Design a protein around this nucleic acid. Structure first.
Ligand SMILES: [K+]
Ligand SMILES: [K+]
Ligand SMILES: [K+]
Ligand SMILES: [K+]
Ligand SMILES: [K+]
Ligand SMILES: [K+]
Ligand SMILES: [Mg+2]
Ligand SMILES: [Mg+2]
Ligand SMILES: [Mg+2]
Ligand SMILES: [Mg+2]
Lengths: 173, 203, 141, 107, 150, 52
RNA sequence: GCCAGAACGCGACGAUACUACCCGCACGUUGUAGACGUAUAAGAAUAGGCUCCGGCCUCGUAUCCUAGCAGGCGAUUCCUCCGCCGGCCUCGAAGUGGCCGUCGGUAAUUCGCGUAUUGCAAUUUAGACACGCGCGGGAUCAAAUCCUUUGCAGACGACUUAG
RNA sequence: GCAUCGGUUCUGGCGGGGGGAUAAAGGCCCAGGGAAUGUGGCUCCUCCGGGAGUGUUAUAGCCCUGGGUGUAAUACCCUCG
């Protein structure tokens, strides 16, 4: 519930030498619409010669997942900055929505590469339709046939306020 | 939460530092505590790391006179545990001194506190806190290697008291077997409707 | 060749396993996501035992000894409901010791002050017969 | 004949004053009530009376026992501790002593 | 929850812990109750509704006349002779010796029997109710008033 | 001598705004939307939404 | 192994005058970091266990005890539960438990008399250890220091000796 | 000490209204198209539990594209008591 995917459409301000300017559309992941629009101008400034003071926003809409109850495999392309230089990566995730996949990606990059939110560009998010499109071995073991496994050494849940138990707890639940 | 006259804690299998912080808070609240079997406490990590820690402690001493003021290094397992507790208490105040007066620590189980109920602090148990595959040591081994002299005396005494317990457990099993038989014979004797009223109430 | 092995035997997470949640509800596993999350739903007629369709974290669930046979992977709510009632999940859940413990706990919490007085008196009348029988068997040793 | 007790209050312990890390305010005290372990449970006891009874040396008007009266005002923290105000602030040697939580103002 | 016929637990005063029967609600938080006197020794008297827990057991009141309750509920029923009955205590014992019980007035003694006659009869028709009203209430260990049903 | 708060004291609210009683009585804060069967999105708003 | 020995760490033993000591009873002129059901003994494993051998284990969310003037006086009725004493065994880590006997008390069932007035709340003055005092019974008849002296000792105290 | 009020403030519960893809899903029904971590059948290897082929709903089911119930429900945001 931290992120949502938005559609943002923007335009250069019309002038007499060019009425009816072109329209550009981007897909932005953001926690709210105030930072969705700020993110839009950031990316457009890097591609076209437009600013916020010489343009305007046309439309903002929320894109919802079409089947948020079906398990899917996702692939993501991204570009990030390390302490010296920039690099490209491709990672994979398994969940039920595009928003869930992006949230897991941001946590994963912070843990394994110490990359902050401010140094990551998302290039493309694609749902992998065929089971033959899975590349990473940590996903392949999850799409194996006839999967099943037990849960050994499970610690029982005990109220914090209850100190001084009178029996030795078990771990076979 | 519950207020008791005294709580007796069986020290086997508890992590040293976590049990120390819980015990310290109980004493400052106004609860009396007794800890037994202090030689069976646990410390996380390999034994060699614990040994190096104590040696660094041993090297500290007053320069101009080693009989006053200096850190006095106690060797017994119960005194190692007592040091950890005293660090989490304002022991230089009158309130702190009174709190420490509510605690007793022992090696083994002396005769006052056998034939008594021993509790457990699940927030400090090793089998519930430590990830399987990591390493741990016992305070009893560390004390033996820094100059504690009574490891074998305690080991022999503990064997004797467990042998007495085996006889006690034998009697306790017989009593339960007879009580179960009495409840069966008396159940189908008299109670025509008390049985169903109690069953509806949940008893 | 003689082999004598004594070890553990756990219940496995699998398609068809029935879970029990924190608030006494039930659900059946239809799809495995990770080693920590599972997609499940329970289409039960009893409003106290039914749960919607969604993802459950395994840390907040317990594995019951009930497994629905031949439940297809990824089956929808209609197919699960048909298999749920054909197998008789509600009847099987009522015969377990977990259910009986829950029922007993509910009854004791619903006692009023007058009920508490009467349960004390009824227990004494049963206790009187217990002491007489216990004295007889113990005297005969 | 009548092998029972006579108890109509709930037990409590005096913990400390309201304080920061290095500053203390005696006008409010913190009390732990036995058996209550969350804010929802502590909401039951708001407004009740609290008694602190102790011994003295001499007799005044037929007794050697004294009382300070107070009431419970609001919860404290997330674990069921509550705040209380007394007619006089408590003596501060009683950090760890016991108090009585009545049921007088009912429902 | 305060309606006539309900069973109340007394929390303070001389009769703390006793289970009584409520008769009527008075003006400013005061209540009128009775034991009855022949079941637990509590006569007709007033209590304040704050110092009371109301249970979920109601007794029938088909026999009580509802006409004598009203003059018991009059303002000066319990006072207007107190200033003279209190001279007995000082006249001796604290000055002389040999204390003796204060006599009960004839009207208050008679009104007790008239009201309680039908009330006891209704109580006797519920099993264990008579013994329940005779005993007193107390807290054991593991009893949490914020969870108890009453 | 003492400021009193409307939105808590009803007498003060009626002193300053005589229309308050009518607003509450006719339930002007619960007016329903006009009737009418609504059309649907024109099948190309949806195509652009999932376009990329 | 060897040196010191906590002057607010501990054990065993000898003799103990002065009612200093022991037992019993009755009081409070008293003190205690804080009674109010101050009720609960297996050991061991946690990628395994318990058992009456039938089975059972997420969960102490348990078990025991719990009614009567702060708990009276009688009856009906029952053979349960509790306590003070005495006799035998037993207990050494800082010494404990069991068996038996006499005596005293006792709602598992069902009743009859009494309760008021503390006036509509005000700690429910109630436990356990210590200490003091006064009786009534037993048991007991001691040492240390100064002083004189020694030189295995020594600044003076202290120390090893003798009277 | 209680009851009825005034000022400030903390904290529970209940009844409605509005918006967006006039939420997205979802259950039931209608029509079309697909495949596999291939259901039932058929074939072969082991009787030692099973495994390997073949192929599109049968004695299980799943995924895409339109339509009806439908101004369905619910979540989230705003708002009158
Ligand atoms: K009576
Ligand atoms: K009686
Ligand atoms: K409010
Ligand atoms: K709507
Ligand atoms: K539909
Ligand atoms: K096949
Ligand atoms: Mg010494
Ligand atoms: Mg107000
Ligand atoms: Mg609609
Ligand atoms: Mg709608």
């Amino acid at each position: 519930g931290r992120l949502q995917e938005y559609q943002v459409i923007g335009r250069h301000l019309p002038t007499e030498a060019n009425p009816n300017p072109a329209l550009y559309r981007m897909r932005i992941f953001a926690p709210n619409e105030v930072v969705a629009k700020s993110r839009f101008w950031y990316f457009l400034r890097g591609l076209k010669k437009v600013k916020k003071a010489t343009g305007e926003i046309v439309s903002v809409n929320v894109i919802s997942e079409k089947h948020p109850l079906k398990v899917k495999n996702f692939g993501i392309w991204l570009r990030y900055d390390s302490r010296s230089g920039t690099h490209n990566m491709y990672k994979e995730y398994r969940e039920t929505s595009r928003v869930a996949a992006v949230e897991a990606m941001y946590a994963d990059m912070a843990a394994r590469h110490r990359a902050r939110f401010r140094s990551i560009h998302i290039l493309k998010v694609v749902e992998l339709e065929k089971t033959e499109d899975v590349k990473r071995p940590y996903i392949k073991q999850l799409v194996a046939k006839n999967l099943s496994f037990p849960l050994p050494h499970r610690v029982p849940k005990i109220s914090t306020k209850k100190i001084f138990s009178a029996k030795r707890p078990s771990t076979f639940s | 939460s519950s207020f008791e006259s005294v709580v007796v804690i069986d020290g086997k299998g508890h992590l040293l530092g976590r049990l120390a912080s819980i015990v310290a808070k109980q004493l400052l609240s106004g609860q009396k505590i007794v800890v037994v079997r202090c030689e069976a406490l646990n410390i996380s990590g390999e034994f060699f790391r614990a040994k190096l820690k104590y040696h660094a402690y041993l090297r500290k001493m007053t320069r101009y006179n080693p009989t006053r003021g200096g850190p006095f290094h106690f060797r017994a397992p119960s005194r190692i545990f007592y040091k950890a507790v005293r660090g989490m208490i304002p022991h230089k105040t009158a309130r702190g001194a009174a709190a420490l007066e509510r605690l007793k620590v022992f090696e083994g189980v002396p005769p006052p506190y056998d034939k008594k109920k021993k509790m457990v602090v699940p927030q400090a148990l090793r089998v519930l806190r430590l990830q399987p595959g990591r390493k741990y040591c016992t305070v009893g081994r560390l004390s033996h290697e820094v100059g504690w002299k009574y490891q074998d005396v305690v080991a022999r005494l503990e064997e004797r008291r467990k042998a007495k317990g085996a006889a006690y457990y034998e009697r306790k099993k017989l009593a339960a077997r007879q009580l179960s038989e009495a409840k069966k014979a008396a159940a189908a004797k008299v109670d025509p409707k008390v049985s169903e009223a109690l069953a509806a109430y949940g008893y | 060749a003689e082999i004598n092995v004594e070890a553990t035997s756990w219940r496995r997470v699998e398609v068809g396993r029935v879970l029990k949640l924190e608030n006494g509800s039930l659900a059946a596993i239809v799809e495995i996501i990770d080693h920590k999350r599972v997609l499940a739903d329970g289409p039960s007629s009893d409003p106290k035992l039914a749960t919607p369709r969604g993802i459950v974290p395994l840390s907040r669930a317990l594995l019951t000894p009930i497994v629905i046979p031949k439940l297809p992977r990824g089956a929808r709510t209609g197919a699960v409901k048909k298999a749920w009632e054909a197998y008789g999940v509600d009847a099987k859940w009522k015969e377990t010791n977990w259910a009986k413990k829950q029922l007993q706990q509910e009854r004791r919490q619903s006692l009023t002050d007058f009920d508490r007085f009467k349960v004390m008196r009824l227990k004494k009348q049963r206790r009187f017969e217990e002491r007489k029988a216990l004295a007889k068997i113990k005297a005969a040793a | 004949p009548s092998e029972a007790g006579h108890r109509l209050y709930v037990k409590g312990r005096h913990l400390s004053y309201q304080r920061g890390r290095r500053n203390t305010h005696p006008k409010t005290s913190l009390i732990k009530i036995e058996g209550v372990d969350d804010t929802a449970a502590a909401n039951f006891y708001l407004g009740k009376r609290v008694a602190y009874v102790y011994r003295a040396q001499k007799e005044v008007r037929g007794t050697k026992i004294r009382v300070i009266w107070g009431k419970i005002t609001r919860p404290h923290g997330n674990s069921g501790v509550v705040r209380a105000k007394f007619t006089h602030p408590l003596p501060a040697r009683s950090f760890g002593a016991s108090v009585r939580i009545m049921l007088y103002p009912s429902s | 929850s305060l309606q006539p016929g309900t069973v109340l637990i007394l929390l303070a005063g001389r009769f703390r812990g006793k289970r009584v029967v409520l008769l009527k609600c008075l003006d400013q938080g005061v209540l009128l109750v009775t034991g009855p006197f022949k079941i637990n020794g509590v006569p007709l008297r007033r209590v304040n509704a704050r110092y009371v827990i109301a249970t979920s057991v109601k007794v029938d009141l088909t026999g009580v006349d509802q006409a004598k309750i009203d003059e018991v509920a009059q303002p000066k029923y319990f006072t207007a002779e107190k200033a003279k009955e209190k001279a007995s205590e000082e006249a001796f014992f604290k000055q002389g010796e040999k204390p003796q019980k204060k006599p009960v007035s004839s009207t208050r003694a008679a009104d007790q029997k008239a009201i309680d006659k039908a009330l006891i009869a209704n109580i006797k028709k519920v099993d264990m109710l008579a013994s329940y009203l005779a005993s007193s209430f107390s807290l054991r260990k593991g009893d949490k008033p914020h969870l108890m049903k009453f | 001598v003492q400021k009193k708060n409307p939105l808590r004291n009803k007498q003060i609210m009626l002193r300053l705004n005589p229309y308050a009683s009518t607003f509450a009585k006719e339930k002007l804060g619960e007016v329903k939307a006009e009737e009418g069967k609504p059309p649907k999105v024109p099948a190309s708003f949806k195509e652009l939404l999932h376009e990329a």
